[PDB]
Each structure stands twice: as structure tokens, then as C-alpha cells.
Ligand binder design. Structure first.
Ligand SMILES: [Mg+2]
Lengths: 50, 48, 115, 51
DNA sequence: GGCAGTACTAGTATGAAAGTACTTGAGCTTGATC
RNA sequence: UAUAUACAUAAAGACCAGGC
DNA sequence: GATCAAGCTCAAGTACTTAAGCCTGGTCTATACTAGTACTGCC
């Protein structure tokens, strides 16, 4: 992407559905949004248990 | 207005920590300053 | 290490009766058959032969659990027709069907070869 | 038997059961019972304490 | 043939926590004395 | 003929990997 | 009436205690220094 692109594609909006398949970058951003799910689930359990 | 919720807010109430991440105070207005936005912004300037 | 023997499905050991007949107290003329070491092959034939008998009000089977091999067949007939008679006529009627099918399949073979 | 799964978050995660003995190697339990223990069947394990 | 020195082996000796509570130091106020 | 061979030992700790 | 000293309170800095539950596997566990004993070489 070009510097200072605030458009929907550059900032992570994925316009494809799992069926048509994600394009390369949308695959990476989709992986960045899923890492935040894995991390929370690993962190919160040890706090909710203490 | 971003406030803390979920488990991070639960440690605050339980531990009764002196300094919460997000202290907040809701304020209600009595007279005509409640209905009018202009009369309200006046009190708004007095609290800030 | 706990896997049951393969033969344990179709073989009876000492003391197990093949069939066990217990009357059913909920209902008049209702009987409940218990067949050890059988499965849906045998149970389904009979049920479907009992429902042709117009003097049979109810017939059905179930395998209580798949890991233990037995069938449980409830039969309810009309008065003055015994549910043990219903279940015997069912078995003799299949034998008279399957003996007719094995003879008709042998004729179609000889016809089929060189004919 | 009493029957457990860790961690025990509330008290529905220890409930007394009534044994029935079946072959092969795994404890077997009704599917409605998988709501309290919060256990789905993929490689899970559950303790058994015989009073 | 015996004694001394050196080497080897065996045993013994030693960045990317956070928060709360307590203690110490400094500053301010009051009292006493000149 | 009688009588006898009865159970104990694999330490503990450290880090590492995985499971739910 | 003013100045100095003492006492009390407040704020800041430093130190001490905790960070999920159960379970299965594996690999690996001192080194260095000193003292004593044995063997070899030389007188
Ligand atoms: Mg699971």
C-alpha cells in the first residue's frame, strides 16, 4: 500500500467472504484480528482463576 | 466515553484500588439547565 | 486392552438363553421378546412381517445399546390372538417367502446362462 | 460415583452419577451433561471418584 | 637398592510487574522564653 | 507324612515439549 | 512581641508479596582444588 492510505482496503476491511476466499492481504489482516482472539483466551483464564 | 469493563474492571471493585484506570462521575441537572443545552453547557464550563 | 472379542457379537456363552419372553403389565395381550446376539438384520425382518398381520396392533424393535447385542421386540395383538402366535407366524411366513425367493433365483440363473 | 472435570468453576462440574459398564476405553456420558461440565468431545478427560 | 620428586587420581568442599504499606524526612505551626 | 518359599523396589529436583 | 525549637502531619520513596486448574511425555544431574599415593628416575 501507498503511504497515508486510509481507504477501506488498506486499513483492514475484508470485502471477500470465506467462500469466495480472502485475497492475500485480507488473509494477513484476518490473521491479525484472530491473533487478538487467541491471546485474550490465553491471558484471561489465568486472571479469572486468581 | 471509553470505560473499563469485564475482568479488568472486576479487579478494581474487588481489590478496592485507590486509583481506577477510568474514574468517572455522572452528573444530573435540576432546573431548566436540564432541558436547555445552552443552560447546560454553562454548568458544563463550571465543572471542567 | 478393553476391546471386546470380535466373536462376542454372534456367539452365546453358557447360560444365555437365545429368546426371553416377558409379559407386559401396561397392556392386555402385550408381550415383549428379548433376543440375545442379534441385530437389525433379524429384528427388522420380523417387525415388518408383523405389521402385515391385521390382528397385530403394535410391533417394534429396538437395540437398547449398540455395544451390547440384543433386540427387544414389543408386540400387542387383538384379544383372543396370542402375541406368541403372532411372532411364530411371522417367522414361518418369512421362511415361506425366502424359500420361494431362493427357488426363483435359481430358475433365473439357469435361464440366464445360455438363454 | 462422583465425576469431575478441571477446572471446576461452579458446582455443576462435580455431579454424582450412576455407573453402567460398557466395553472399550472411554467414559461415556449423555450429551445434555456436556453443558454443565463445559466439555466437548475432542481429547477431553474427566476424573472419577468412587465413594 | 633406596630416596626423592613429579604426576595422576580420587575425594571433598562450595526491555516488555504492579500495587500497597510502612518509614523517614521535611515543612509548618504553636508554645515558650527572652 | 508334615512344613515351607508374601511382596518390595524403582530417589528427588530441574528445565523443555504437548494436552484440555 | 519576636524568634527559636520541638512536635506532628503529610508526602515521597523504597521494599516486599503475589501472579490457573488438572494431566502426559522426555533429558539430565558439578567442577575445581587439594591431598595422598604410586611409579619412575637418579644418586
Ligand atoms: Mg475440548
Amino acid at each position: 500500500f501507498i503511504k497515508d492510505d486510509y481507504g477501506p482496503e488498506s486499513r483492514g476491511f475484508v470485502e471477500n467472504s470465506y467462500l469466495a476466499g480472502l485475497t492475500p492481504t485480507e488473509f494477513f489482516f484476518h490473521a491479525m484480528g484472530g491473533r487478538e482472539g487467541l491471546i485474550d483466551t490465553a491471558v484471561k483464564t489465568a486472571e479469572t482463576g486468581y | 466515553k471509553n470505560v473499563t469493563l469485564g475482568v479488568p474492571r472486576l479487579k478494581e471493585l474487588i481489590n478496592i484500588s485507590k486509583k481506577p484506570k477510568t474514574p468517572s462521575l455522572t452528573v444530573f441537572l435540576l432546573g431548566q439547565s436540564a432541558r436547555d443545552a445552552e443552560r447546560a453547557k454553562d454548568i458544563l464550563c463550571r465543572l471542567e | 486392552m478393553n476391546a471386546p472379542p470380535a466373536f462376542e457379537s454372534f456367539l452365546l456363552f453358557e447360560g444365555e438363553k437365545k429368546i426371553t419372553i416377558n409379559k407386559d403389565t401396561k397392556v392386555p395381550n402385550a408381550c415383549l421378546f428379548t433376543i440375545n446376539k442379534e441385530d437389525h438384520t433379524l429384528g427388522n425382518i420380523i417387525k415388518s412381517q408383523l405389521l402385515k398381520d391385521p390382528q397385530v396392533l403394535f410391533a417394534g424393535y429396538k437395540v437398547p445399546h449398540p455395544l451390547e447385542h440384543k433386540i427387544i421386540i414389543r408386540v400387542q395383538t387383538t384379544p383372543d390372538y396370542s402375541p406368541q402366535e403372532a411372532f411364530t407366524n411371522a417367522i414361518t411366513d418369512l421362511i415361506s417367502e425366502l424359500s420361494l425367493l431362493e427357488e426363483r433365483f435359481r430358475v433365473a440363473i439357469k435361464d440366464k446362462q445360455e438363454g | 460415583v462422583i465425576f469431575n472435570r478441571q477446572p471446576t468453576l461452579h458446582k455443576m462440574s462435580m455431579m454424582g452419577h450412576r455407573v453402567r459398564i460398557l466395553p472399550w476405553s472411554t467414559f461415556r456420558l449423555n450429551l445434555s451433561v456436556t453443558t454443565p461440565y463445559n466439555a466437548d468431545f475432542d481429547g477431553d478427560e474427566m476424573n472419577l471418584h468412587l465413594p
